């Protein structure tokens, strides 16, 4: 819907900074707002699909909210999308968006967090050996702590 998309736009036009949207989807009525606004140059923004399904959804965006310095607006937290503001709107330095891929460089924040995640995820990695059969859990550690190389 258009209505809830105004408060986020209202905040970003005030600061004059680009916006990146991560959500389950942005349908035509909402999407038409940004793209029309994007051509006129009042904002420079892009919208992307959420990374994964189910529990894989929750894990991914929680990590994303961590290195960006903001927070994830979840159903549990209960913040209505109308009432969101700049305070918990996360930040980054550079983002690259292409037809099927998005990359976030990182805000260099949450040092105590990223050291923490290294701990339980490895503590979870050893415990998940009974069930896991994909590097997605190690890659989850790798993405926020190092990088990945594809030979």
């Amino acid at each position: 819907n258009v209505k809830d998309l105004l408060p986020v736009l209202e905040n970003v036009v005030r600061a004059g900074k680009p916006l990146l949207i991560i959500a389950e989807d942005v349908e035509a009525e909402a999407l038409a707002t940004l793209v029309v606004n994007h051509i006129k140059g009042v904002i420079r923004a892009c919208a992307v699909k959420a990374p994964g399904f189910g529990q894989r959804r929750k894990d991914y965006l929680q990590d994303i909210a961590i290195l960006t310095g903001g927070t994830a607006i979840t159903e549990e937290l209960g913040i209505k999308l109308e009432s969101v503001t700049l305070d918990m709107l996360g930040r980054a330095d550079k983002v690259i968006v292409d037809k099927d891929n998005t990359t976030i460089v990182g805000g260099k924040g949450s040092k105590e967090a990223i050291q923490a995640r290294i701990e339980q995820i490895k503590r979870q990695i050893l415990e998940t050996t009974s069930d896991y059969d994909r590097e997605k859990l190690q890659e989850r550690l790798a993405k926020l702590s190092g990088g990945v190389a594809i030979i």
Partner: protein, 94 residues
């Protein structure tokens, strides 16, 4: 051209514009509601009471009324569209 009878009022519905917020955000036409603001082009003789008395309408030629989101008949007149509407469904003025 049209003269309303009794309590009827014929209104022009503020025409169409592209709406922009004071911050400069433009809303696409697919997400805009038709304006509820209108200007009266003619007024009727007045509401006819149960005793036969007629009360003069308070709306005038140069005012700005607001509709209750649905009122009107959307008549056509040589390409021009008017909104015949009634006093009891007038929300407010200016």
């Amino acid at each position: 051209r049209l003269r309303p009878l009794y309590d009827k009022i014929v209104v022009k519905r503020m025409e169409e514009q592209e709406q922009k917020t004071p911050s400069g955000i433009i809303i696409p036409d697919t997400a805009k509601e038709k304006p509820q603001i209108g200007e009266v082009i003619a007024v009727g003789d007045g509401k006819l009471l149960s005793n036969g008395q007629i009360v003069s309408p308070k709306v005038k030629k140069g005012d700005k009324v607001v509709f209750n989101k649905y009122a009107g008949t959307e008549v056509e007149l040589d390409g021009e569209k008017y909104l015949i509407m009634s006093e009891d469904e007038v929300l407010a003025v200016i």
